[PDB]
Amino acid sequence: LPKPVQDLIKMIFPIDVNYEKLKTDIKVVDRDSEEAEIIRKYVKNTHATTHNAYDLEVIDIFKIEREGECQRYKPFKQLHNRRLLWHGSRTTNFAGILSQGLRIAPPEAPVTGYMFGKGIYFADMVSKSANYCHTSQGDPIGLILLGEVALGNMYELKHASHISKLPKGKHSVKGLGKTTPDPSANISLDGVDVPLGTGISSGVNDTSLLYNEYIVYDIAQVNLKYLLKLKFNF
Ligand SMILES: Cc1cc(N)c(NC(=O)c2cccc(-c3nc4c(C(N)=O)cccc4[nH]3)c2)cc1C
Numbered sequence: 001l002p003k004p005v006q007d008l009i010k011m012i013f014p015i016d017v018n019y020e021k022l023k024t025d026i027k028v029v030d031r032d033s034e035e036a037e038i039i040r041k042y043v044k045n046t047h048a049t050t051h052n053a054y055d056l057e058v059i060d061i062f063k064i065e066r067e068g069e070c071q072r073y074k075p076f077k078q079l080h081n082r083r084l085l086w087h088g089s090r091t092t093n094f095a096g097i098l099s100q101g102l103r104i105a106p107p108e109a110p111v112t113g114y115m116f117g118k119g120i121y122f123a124d125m126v127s128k129s130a131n132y133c134h135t136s137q138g139d140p141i142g143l144i145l146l147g148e149v150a151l152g153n154m155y156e157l158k159h160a161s162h163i164s165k166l167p168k169g170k171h172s173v174k175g176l177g178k179t180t181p182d183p184s185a186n187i188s189l190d191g192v193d194v195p196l197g198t199g200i201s202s203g204v205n206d207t208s209l210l211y212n213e214y215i216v217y218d219i220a221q222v223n224l225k226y227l228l229k230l231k232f233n234f
């Protein structure tokens with residue numbers, strides 16, 4: 001395996017045995033390629049200003065295909081409003097995330113900590129998701145996912161709801177932030193919208209959220225595309 005992939009396997013845990021454990025094809029993305037430049041732009045432009053504790057710096061970019069995930073995502077790949085969005089988590093979770101995919105809290109679990117109910121959460125501001133890696137100066141390396149999310153018809157909300165059931169015809173929730181990546185800069189990679197614009201005012205002022213959130217309540221609406229290794233500089 002390429003050295004970057006070996007260092008990734010060591011981060012989240014011999015090597016080839018654990019790699020097969022992940023049930024995931026992992027490939028290194030060329031630094032000089034356009035995938036990489038699009039991703040680095042996304043990172044650079046969507047760093048919120050209230051998250052000035054750290055600067056982000058991309059170390060490695062991996063293209064990942066989880067086993068079965070594309071065959072499971074099928075019914076939503078034609079779904080309009082597909083979007084490439086961040087998801088952060090503690091390094092410890094990633095072994096599981098890759099082997100089993102992003103999951104939903106169990107049906108009988110408290111909803112009080114879930115601003116928009118028990119679903120799978122995403123941001124379009126890199127720092128908003130990077131906050132959920134919970135890295136520090138003692139461990140300034142973390143992992144963020146980029147997922148293709150089949151948002152469909154969004155239920156746009158300004159305030160928490162704490163339930164997991166959508167109205168009919170809705171497929172996702174968008175928590176509306178006061179700040180959103182400039183839509184005039186969105187680009188379409190492989191049919192999927194990448195909101196890599198610099199943050200500008202959304203025009204919403206009646207809202208609880210500084211930045212957007214995107215929630216889906218079916219694990220088949222997610223197709224993990226990339227995994228970034230980030231250095232946090234505090
Ligand atoms: C060890 C461990 C334990 C637990 N319980 C969790 N989960 C939560 O604390 C939790 C619960 C509810 C919502 C969200 C949440 N995530 C995001 C993200 C993201 N992720 O980029 C992006 C935008 C909005 C978000 N809202 C997170 C995570 C980890 C690593």
Ligand SMILES: OC[C@H]1O[C@@](CO)(O[C@H]2O[C@H](CO)[C@@H](O)[C@H](O)[C@H]2O)[C@@H](O)[C@@H]1O
Nearest residue numbers: 166167168169170171172216217218221
């Ligand atoms: O579509 C998958 C997922 O969407 C949910 C809500 O998240 O329901 C939506 O999609 C259904 C299938 O098209 C629609 O019938 C429904 O009207 C719509 O809200 C879930 O039911 C489902 O797991």
